[PDB]
Amino acid sequence: ARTKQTARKSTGGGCCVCSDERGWAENPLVYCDGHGCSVAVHQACYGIVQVPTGPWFCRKCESQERAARVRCELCPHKDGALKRTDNGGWAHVVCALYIPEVQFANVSTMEPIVLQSVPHDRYNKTCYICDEQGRESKAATGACMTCNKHGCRQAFHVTCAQFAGLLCEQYCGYCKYHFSKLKK
Ligand SMILES: [Zn+2]
Ligand SMILES: [Zn+2]
Ligand SMILES: [Zn+2]
Ligand SMILES: [Zn+2]
Ligand SMILES: [Zn+2]
């Protein structure tokens, strides 16, 4: 597999789940070899038990599922690191991690992603970011996390917060207003 195992920048992107650009000897950043696929994930961020000596393919590329059928059940963005769900669909690993009540059937392999126990309070929210970034039709879809500032009611999709730099590592996120004043 093509991997990065250090933080070194060659004298000659980052993880889809955790956004870290560095790799480790015991936790490499592995790059999907699927055609036109740009997934890169840490072994531990994606549940790769054995990094192959040959090519490595993410689960979506392995499935060769129709590109029309590859969609996260929990957010409106495709691309990124996906696993199959218990309901016969797909979901981002990052969405699974940052929506509190989502689980994995196996935490070593991090799959399938289990949605059966999400309560309806993740599902009746509106993503304020989608409402801001020209995605008004998708803002009320999928599942939102809530700002981790106690009492805040701002809600947002995990991936939308991820793209906005509003997640942090317990897996939580803050609306932009409240994130600005948090000591990083
Ligand atoms: Zn990672
Ligand atoms: Zn792939
Ligand atoms: Zn998602
Ligand atoms: Zn959104
Ligand atoms: Zn907030």
The structure was resolved experimentally with: X-ray
**Dist CA 146 CA 166 (whole Å):** 11
The amino acid at 85: T
The phi, psi pair for 45, rounded to 5°, reads -75, -15
Q: Say how many Å lie between the CA of residue 18 and the centre of ligand 1.
A: 4
The answer to whether 1-64 and 68-184 have equal CATH topology is yes
**Dist CA 7 CA 15 (whole Å):** 13
Whether the Cβ atoms of residue 68 and residue 95 lie closer than 8 Å to each other: no
Domain ranges of the chain: 1-64, 68-184
Q: Which residue has the tokens 């805040």?
A: 152
Three-state helix/strand/coil letters over 90-144:
EEEHHHHHHCCCCEECCCCCCCCEECCCCCHHHCCCCEHHHHHCCCHHHCCCCCC
**Dist CA 7 CA 61 (whole Å):** 27
Q: Say how many Å lie between the CA of residue 137 and the centre of ligand 1.
A: 30
Please, what's the largest Cα pairwise distance for the chain? 51
Q: Say how many Å lie between the CA of residue 179 and the centre of ligand 5.
A: 7
Q: Which ligand is nearest to the CA of 127?
A: 4
Q: Which residues contact 177 (CB under 8 A, 6 or more apart)?
A: 154
Burial group, residue 115, by CB count within 10 angstroms (0-12, 13-18, 19+) = buried
Tell which CATH architecture fits domain 1-64.
Answer: 2-Layer Sandwich (3.30)
Fold adopted by 68-184: Herpes Virus-1 (3.30.40)
